Design an enzyme around this catalytic site. Structure first.
Site, PDB file in Angstrom:
ATOM      1  N   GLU A 276       1.239   2.382  13.612  1.00 55.40           N
ATOM      2  CA  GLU A 276       0.108   2.434  12.688  1.00 55.40           C
ATOM      3  C   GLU A 276      -1.038   1.595  13.245  1.00 55.40           C
ATOM      4  OE1 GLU A 276       1.017   0.541   8.951  1.00 55.40           O
ATOM      5  OE2 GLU A 276       3.054   0.021   9.586  1.00 55.40           O
TER       6      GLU A 276
ATOM      7  N   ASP B 185       0.872  -1.172   0.000  1.00 54.75           N
ATOM      8  CA  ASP B 185       0.000   0.000   0.000  1.00 54.75           C
ATOM      9  C   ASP B 185       0.908   1.220   0.000  1.00 54.75           C
ATOM     10  OD1 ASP B 185      -1.640   2.195   0.545  1.00 54.75           O
ATOM     11  OD2 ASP B 185      -3.022   1.018   1.767  1.00 54.75           O
TER      12      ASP B 185
ATOM     13  N   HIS C  60      -5.580   0.322   1.565  1.00 55.72           N
ATOM     14  CA  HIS C  60      -5.996  -1.020   1.955  1.00 55.72           C
ATOM     15  C   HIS C  60      -7.046  -0.963   3.068  1.00 55.72           C
ATOM     16  CE1 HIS C  60      -3.105  -0.397   5.263  1.00 55.72           C
ATOM     17  NE2 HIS C  60      -3.761  -1.358   5.886  1.00 55.72           N
TER      18      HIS C  60
ATOM     19  N   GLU D  32      -9.597  -3.635  15.968  1.00 55.03           N
ATOM     20  CA  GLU D  32      -8.391  -4.241  16.551  1.00 55.03           C
ATOM     21  C   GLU D  32      -8.069  -3.647  17.923  1.00 55.03           C
ATOM     22  OE1 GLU D  32      -5.054  -4.681  13.937  1.00 55.03           O
ATOM     23  OE2 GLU D  32      -6.306  -4.643  12.129  1.00 55.03           O
TER      24      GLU D  32
HETATM   25  N1  LIG Z   1      -3.709  -1.692   8.983  1.00 56.80           N
HETATM   26  C1  LIG Z   1      -2.858  -1.541  10.190  1.00 56.80           C
HETATM   27  C2  LIG Z   1      -2.265  -2.861  10.622  1.00 56.80           C
HETATM   28  C3  LIG Z   1      -1.619  -2.717  11.984  1.00 56.80           C
HETATM   29  S1  LIG Z   1      -0.044  -3.597  12.191  1.00 56.80           S
HETATM   30  C4  LIG Z   1      -0.131  -4.126  13.921  1.00 56.80           C
HETATM   31  C5  LIG Z   1       1.241  -4.597  14.362  1.00 56.80           C
HETATM   32  O1  LIG Z   1       1.393  -4.302  15.769  1.00 56.80           O
HETATM   33  C6  LIG Z   1       1.471  -5.505  16.510  1.00 56.80           C
HETATM   34  N2  LIG Z   1       0.756  -5.320  17.769  1.00 56.80           N
HETATM   35  C7  LIG Z   1      -0.595  -5.162  17.936  1.00 56.80           C
HETATM   36  N3  LIG Z   1      -0.964  -4.985  19.181  1.00 56.80           N
HETATM   37  C8  LIG Z   1       0.229  -5.032  19.888  1.00 56.80           C
HETATM   38  C9  LIG Z   1       0.525  -4.907  21.258  1.00 56.80           C
HETATM   39  N4  LIG Z   1      -0.396  -4.690  22.202  1.00 56.80           N
HETATM   40  N5  LIG Z   1       1.820  -5.005  21.632  1.00 56.80           N
HETATM   41  C10 LIG Z   1       2.746  -5.213  20.691  1.00 56.80           C
HETATM   42  N6  LIG Z   1       2.588  -5.343  19.370  1.00 56.80           N
HETATM   43  C11 LIG Z   1       1.297  -5.242  19.030  1.00 56.80           C
HETATM   44  C12 LIG Z   1       0.897  -6.600  15.612  1.00 56.80           C
HETATM   45  O2  LIG Z   1       1.459  -7.864  15.945  1.00 56.80           O
HETATM   46  C13 LIG Z   1       1.351  -6.115  14.234  1.00 56.80           C
HETATM   47  O3  LIG Z   1       2.691  -6.503  13.957  1.00 56.80           O
END
Ligand SMILES: NCCCSC[C@H]1O[C@@H](n2cnc3c(N)ncnc32)[C@H](O)[C@@H]1O
Ligand SMILES: NCCCSC[C@H]1O[C@@H](n2cnc3c(N)ncnc32)[C@H](O)[C@@H]1O
Ligand SMILES: NCCCSC[C@H]1O[C@@H](n2cnc3c(N)ncnc32)[C@H](O)[C@@H]1O
Ligand SMILES: NCCCSC[C@H]1O[C@@H](n2cnc3c(N)ncnc32)[C@H](O)[C@@H]1O
Lengths: 343, 342, 340, 341
Positions: B123, B31, B280, B132
């Site tokens: 992000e 993206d 996305h 989430e």
């Molecule tokens: N479209 C946007 C997509 C978002 S990417 C979210 C990223 O943050 C991590 N992650 C999520 N919650 C978390 C937490 N509480 N602690 C650590 N890592 C975390 C998760 O495993 C992923 O690698």
């Protein structure tokens, strides 16, 4: 219970939540091959159901139980562990069969039935048959089956055959090669390319294909549900020996399955083979990490080893070699996370 | 921890297994609106990072931490709870940044950092921004932020507007019609007809659309991540009052979000609006179980309420009303499980 | 007789409708109807030449003029509506007063001077049986000499299952108005069922592409020369289709053929979708819920026609897929159809 | 009563027609109708607060619910067709059985047990008076307390001369079908005259551009508070138009307004061609012969409406150019209008 001991709760929660949705029941009921064949198998063998006692394992919406009623069953115990059991009760009421169908909410490993049954019915088949490990619940239920009892389905056949598909194989590297670049916004990703390749090859591919990609007659592995035990499915070893019809590269093994309903009146087959009309099971392909070259007449021998895991699925281990050359290959796949490639 | 109390373990296991896959990282990285804008926001505000201490919450493959390194950050603590942390460390080594990027495996609610940080990056935006429930982990991390510190993104704007789309409406209502059959293979299904309709209309629709379906100017709800508390996101109440511009049926509400990186040098906006290039995140539409009619000039008022649940998502209740006529519509939706229409 | 099988209210509006010249024009501009009728009579002019004719429902009198052209010595033209006055006008202006005798009144009431050799009429309505005029047409046989003939002589009804997702959603959409929980603040959902019934009680009158038909049609014949008046009070049509294609069956399509079994040749008047369009078009009855059937399956059931006092029929259709047991039942009011 | 001024045949078909939900649906989809009625009631909630209301011809009962929203104490909803049944249901499901009382039967036949403070209804048909339900509305005033109100309170009919060469020619193009000597060997000529008369007896129901109107409209008001039902058996509307534009006048255009004179404000429901189109549209009656008029000439005459046993009106129109003495007339059956839209 037997179920909780082989299943990690995290998996069980998501599994039964998934089946609580009416949308999922609809999708399954709209597979006419599935729905139709079951109805036919039951109705054309009404002498196996007429005034009998029936057990429906994982009845879902309860469609199978209604088919058992149409066949003339006296009493049907329909067991369902998800919240779909609520909706089942509704349909039994609205269809005025509350006197013949008894919905029992719970897992078949935990509930208790008042009597033995003449026959057990269920649709436990997952991807390449064993996915979801529901076959073990199906076999577990046999504790409620009379020694005379039958089972629909009665047997399960898994089919293995080697395939050539250059485009499917190249696809894995095209995708992984995203990582093979030295400056994605200033970041060199190339170091993860190997890990990306492996990840893609660990996914069984769910879709259909032209039967002309198959390079040898299929090998068959049968499960007799009347004779088999739960523990027989924890470890499923499928030796194979393929006599190659055509010379070429073999990129992996394709899988599909059949089940037969062996009634008193006739045997009815439900097939998900690529020669048959497509079903929601499609077919499953497992790539080899490295293709094996074999000329026609050569022999491709090896073992497909399915090892059950706590995530309600199987770890797939395939080892294969060309006997005449000693050329060897293997792969380890996770059947819980397949890649859905169908258009 | 704070995380384990608000989260059903079943949801957490699945959640962090999903993000353990490289294919998922590739999808997010491809993206270019997302990746390009994030890089722009950080690099054009490099004074906010140069020689600073940075915290990357949920670093994944670690892309943002690399951007912060490019901008001159002295130390970047990259926290990741999934197994993607191992891949991040691989990239840190192969990019010769071991002296600047420190991968710290674990949940941000549970790990301990050596020092307070000047800025937090992440992000945490999901479908409708809030899916989430990771904004909470983002805000929780503020316990490591200096008083003078900043946050990228700094704020989140939620936009909502009424839309008309008969085709989409029939589409979802049609799938419920399967459970109207009086004799499916001789079985009467119509008893479950109501539950089926409910189930399908509880699904938010994720896709894009032409902006000419929007029948009024969008309403805005702003979350300030610098000032907001974790618990502020447990219950989010968004009242709205639309002045209809065109006449016709309103089949539901359309949703999208903007986030701003309020830097010292420049503010940089990342928009998922239907007027902007597609991302996305797409847009999200919640359908009314029954459409409401309104003439141009009428007022459509009501509230969108977001109730946090233990499956790392929100229970959405939308009540809409045509003030002039009293035409009301109420619907509930499960943001956790949306319908991907694209 | 006619009075006892018909509510006065329906009879008034009925003969008031056929008193308008605009309707006669509409029927006469159907060159398929008019042309075929004229051909059937003239091609078999031996059945008319120097014969006694009875025109049941002459209207403007067009049929009687055709009977006159064929060489009929005397034609008794019976008309109940005020159109009888207009017919007499045309008789005089066409100098046929010695040949065509207009007789005002209902055929069940008037007295004729002699027995007739042949009866002519056009009692076919939508689905052939609408208007219940076939009964009056049969009743007139009391004036028919033995060995006499009837134009039309027979009537073929054709039924076939069709697929039309669009049409189905159209009628479902209209019924979706009464699902509103707060229409101007009012809950209408309680009447959703009643609305669905009402809209699906309506037969759809229009034309369609034959490719929607998923099986060969069934034929149900009514021989007017042998049929008794009492036979059309209740008409039961058994059907057993062999599905050719797989898909959803949204209902049954209806059309009719009538034959003029004359002396020289038989002439057919068809309203089939394969034939040129007529003012009768075709008629389709919708299932409240479509049934699924795969090619090779058999669709069985009975279409039951019960005559009502409103000069129409109450149409009960029950259908099932024999292989699966998928069943559907719907009742339709032929009196109030939907023209799209 | 209703039975005395109505032929049984017409009564059957009239109430059968209104027993259909599809009919109630089409009327409720006219926002101008439903909206204005709701607007009128709620914006005058003072005339409904805890009052007693009578709903003549409640149909689906939509009007009764609107009165309830305004805080009415009791609402008597009368309905002679089988639509009364479905009304029962909507009262039950909306939890208003203790406020709304449905009564199956004709308002002039049913037995009402109390006096009311206000009467609500939708009696307007084509040209306002069609259906003659406007008489049942006035008949219900026997249950009305003195000083009470009526919704609608007044009704206005507007008459204007129009020029439409295309509309006038259409009648002859249609009738001239009969003017051929050999239709399949038959001479139809002799019925041409009859065909012409038949077409001209049909008022035309459709809409039109305001530019065809050749003079400001005349207005005839019916005050529903100050009128007896007998006043409608014979409605005489003398007119006198001063011609704006010079040309041929092919007939008179009709449309109506109704007003809801409440304690707070007066609300207007208009079906004028200058206003958004409604399911009433407008109505036009052709002259047998067009009348030529100069800009300045005066078109005088009378429009006489005579109630008949078919729940409608026979329309007699006579008009002349005073400066010329040229006169034309026509007679129309409002029960059989031609829908041209
Ligand atoms: N479209 C946007 C997509 C978002 S990417 C979210 C990223 O943050 C991590 N992650 C999520 N919650 C978390 C937490 N509480 N602690 C650590 N890592 C975390 C998760 O495993 C992923 O690698
Ligand atoms: N076409 C491939 C899908 C077959 S439908 C699988 C059905 O069996 C139920 N089910 C699964 N395990 C179960 C158990 N141990 N006890 C009861 N029900 C169970 C599950 O909830 C679902 O409704
Ligand atoms: N395409 C549809 C064909 C309709 S034309 C049939 C003509 O016969 C008249 N008619 C009807 N019933 C009648 C009866 N019992 N006796 C005499 N005339 C009758 C009816 O009024 C009409 O003018
Ligand atoms: N465009 C607006 C159209 C007017 S809706 C006409 C409504 O008034 C009822 N109605 C008519 N006459 C009636 C009577 N005498 N008594 C009771 N209900 C009556 C009729 O049944 C229908 O529900």
């Amino acid at each position: 219970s037997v179920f909780s001991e082989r299943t990690e709760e995290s998996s069980a929660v998501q599994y039964f939540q998934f089946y609580g949705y009416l949308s999922q029941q609809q999708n399954m009921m709209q597979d006419y091959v599935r729905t139709g064949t079951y109805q036919r198998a039951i109705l054309q063998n009404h002498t196996d159901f007429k005034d009998k006692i029936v057990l429906d394992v994982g009845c879902g919406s309860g469609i199978l139980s209604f088919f058992a009623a149409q066949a003339g069953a006296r009493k049907i115990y329909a067991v369902e562990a998800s919240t779909m059991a609520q909706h089942a009760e509704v349909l039994v009421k609205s269809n005025n069969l509350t006197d013949r169908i008894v919905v029992i909410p719970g897992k078949v490993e935990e509930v208790s039935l008042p009597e033995q049954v003449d026959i057990i019915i269920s649709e436990p088949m997952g991807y390449m048959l064993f996915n979801e490990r529901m076959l073990e619940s199906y076999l577990h239920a046999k504790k409620y089956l009379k020694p005379s009892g039958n089972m629909f389905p009665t047997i399960g056949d898994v089919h293995l055959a080697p395939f050539t598909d250059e485009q499917l194989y190249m696809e894995q590297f095209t995708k992984a090669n995203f990582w093979y670049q030295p400056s994605f916004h200033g970041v060199d990703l190339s170091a993860l390319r190997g890990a990306a390749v492996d990840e893609y090859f660990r996914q069984p591919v769910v879709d259909t294909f032209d039967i002309r990609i198959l390079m040898a007659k299929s090998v068959k592995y049968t499960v007799n549900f009347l004779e088999a035990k739960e523990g027989d499915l924890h470890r499923i070893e499928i030796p194979f020996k393929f006599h190659m019809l055509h010379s070429g590269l073999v990129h992996g093994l394709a899988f599909w399955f059949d089940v037969a309903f062996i009634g008193s009146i006739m045997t009815v087959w439900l097939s998900t083979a690529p020669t048959e009309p497509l079903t929601h099971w499609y077919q499953v392909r497992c790539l080899f990490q490295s293709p094996l070259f074999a000329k026609a007449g050569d022999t491709l021998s090896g073992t497909c080893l399915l090892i059950a895991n706590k995530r309600q699925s199987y770890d797939i281990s395939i080892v294969a070699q060309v006997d005449q050359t000693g050329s060897k290959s293997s792969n380890l796949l996770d059947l819980k996370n397949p890649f859905f490639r169908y258009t």
